[PDB]
Structures are given as C-alpha cells and as structure tokens.
Design a protein around this ligand. Structure first.
Ligand SMILES: COc1ccccc1CC(=O)N1CCCC[C@H](C(N)=O)C1
Ligand SMILES: [Zn+2]
Length: 139
C-alpha cells in the first residue's frame, strides 16, 4: 500500500484505489496501473522533473529503503493477475531489488523528488510506475 499526496491530488496504484478514490476521480489509466483522485487537504509531497535512473525506494515487506538503478519508462509485458489480464504495462521502470505484491504503493525518490510508485515485481525484480511526465500534478 501507499500513495503520493501532491497539491490537491492523491496518486495510487489503480488496482488498490478505494471507493472514495473512484468517487473523486481525476484521471486513471489501466495501461499504467495509475489512478489520481482529488483531495480537500493540501499534499505533503513534491514531484521530480528529471531523467534520473538511480534513486531509493521504500519496501514495506522489509520495513527498509533500498537504493536502485532502474530502466527508463517503457512498455513491458506483465503476466495476468487477479487485477488485470495479460497485457503490456506502459511507463514502467524495472530494477533489481526485493518486492512482494503488497509492496505496491511504496515511493521511489531521487534527489529531485518523487519519481514513481512500486507497481510490479518478480524474483529479485521491482517495477515502478513513473509519474514524472504528469506535469499537471504541479498545478
Ligand atoms: C509488486 O508486485 C509483485 C512483486 C513480486 C512478485 C509479484 C508481484 C505482483 C505483480 O507484479 N503484479 C500482480 C499483482 C498486482 C498488479 C501488478 C500490475 N501492475 O499489473 C502485477
Ligand atoms: Zn531526479
């Protein structure tokens, strides 16, 4: 679990969005596993606007942060799950690091701010949904 709170927006994994997120929907994209909802309170986070390929993510299944080198956002095949059919997930960045399904929502940050959130993983892999291209989150 986990979310990004920026301005009057809450960014979550689309597959973990609540009834309240959907009732206050701003934007969602199944191909990216992202959903953004509106909030009444002002958010605590700031978004990176950069091309960093290293950063640190929070891993809830270890209660720890880990450094990572990750690939640029791209279209990657993701196997079927309870939440989605087998499909290509876009704007996804992969890295070597520990993850379990419940780690979705953990934030990946570089020195410039929030880069994205955990969205996929595998045997010693962790994948992050990028949010740096969503320029409208800042206004
Ligand atoms: C962090 O997730 C994992 C980590 C280790 C192993 C497996 C997973 C689970 C995973 O990658 N899934 C299935 C559940 C959620 C939806 C994801 C998606 N974005 O399509 C894909
Ligand atoms: Zn950066």
């Amino acid at each position: 679990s986990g979310a990004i709170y920026v301005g009057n927006y809450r960014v979550v994994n689309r597959h973990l969005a609540t009834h309240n997120d959907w009732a206050n929907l701003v934007w969602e994209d199944s191909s990216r596993d992202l959903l953004v909802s509106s909030t009444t309170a002002q958010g605590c986070d700031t978004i990176a606007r950069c091309d960093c390929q290293t950063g640190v993510y929070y891993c809830s299944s270890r209660r720890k942060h880990y450094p990572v080198s990750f690939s640029k956002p791209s279209l990657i095949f993701v196997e079927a799950s309870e939440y989605y059919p087998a499909r290509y997930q876009s704007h996804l960045m992969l890295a070597v690091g520990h993850s379990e399904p419940g780690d979705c929502g953990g934030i990946l940050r570089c020195q410039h701010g929030v880069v994205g959130i955990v969205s996929t993983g595998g045997n010693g892999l962790v994948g992050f949904a990028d949010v740096r291209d969503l320029l409208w989150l800042d206004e």
